[PDB]
């Protein structure tokens, strides 16, 4: 066997979501951006439901649950795209029906952002990131998201500690060849933070330019004060 938290997060994993780009709409930056924002709005619903499965999360105040999700949502979305892309080459699997190559990224105005996502992919391919490690890092990214609005600083530190312990226990059992592998996984979080913050800034600016329709939950998460 292995670590129960890691096993629990694997069973909490949401189902795959299709992008369903509109086949009637001519290809354009607006179409690509609309498709991605619609897909993110849908994935946000299942992320909220997923977070409730994380031990201790639902015991925080609703304010602290909101703060963690408002800080971490884009890291959680990006880590999904990264994980889905590990068996691919220079391509991002937003969804099984929405795989973006460099041309599509350029056409959507996402070349710089998607190149940074591919830098995350490159590092996790070299580390041979496992699904167990991915789900544990998603939960650590939520807990460690550095909201400036936390009420119960100690409870959020205890949630970080619980999930860090789960990663370290997992690695101690599954990866005896590399006693520092848990710390190597923790050392990938700064690039995820950097890429997330760029993506939020990029989509905030698309929101201000007003040419790409966005649904209610996505707009709520974009407008959050961070």
């Amino acid at each position: 066997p292995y670590n129960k938290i890691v096993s629990h997060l694997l069973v909490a994993e949401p189902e795959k979501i299709y992008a369903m780009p509109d086949p009637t709409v001519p290809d354009s930056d607006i179409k690509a951006l609309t498709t991605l924002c619609d897909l993110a709005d849908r994935e946000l619903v299942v992320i909220i439901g997923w977070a409730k499965h994380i031990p201790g999360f639902s015991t925080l105040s609703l304010a602290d649950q909101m703060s963690l999700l408002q800080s971490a949502w884009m890291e959680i979305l990006i880590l999904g795209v990264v994980y889905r892309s590990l068996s691919f080459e220079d391509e991002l699997v937003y969804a099984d029906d929405y795989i973006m190559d460099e041309d599509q990224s350029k056409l959507a105005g996402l070349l710089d952002l998607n190149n940074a996502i591919l830098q995350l992919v490159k590092k996790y391919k070299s580390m041979k990131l496992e699904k167990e490690e991915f789900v544990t890092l998603k939960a650590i990214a939520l807990a460690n998201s550095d909201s400036m609005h936390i009420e119960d600083v100690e409870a959020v530190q205890k949630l970080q500690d619980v999930l860090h312990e789960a990663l370290q226990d997992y690695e101690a059992g599954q990866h005896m060849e590399d006693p520092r592998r848990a710390g190597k996984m923790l050392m990938t979080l700064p690039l995820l933070r950097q890429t997330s913050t760029k993506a939020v800034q990029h989509f905030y600016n698309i929101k201000l330019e007003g040419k790409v329709p966005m649904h209610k939950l996505f707009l709520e998460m974009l407008e959050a004060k961070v």
Partner: peptide, 10 residues
């Protein structure tokens, strides 16, 4: 009022 709060209360 917040959709995020509504979905956390489910």
């Amino acid at each position: 009022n917040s959709l995020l709060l509504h979905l956390l209360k489910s």
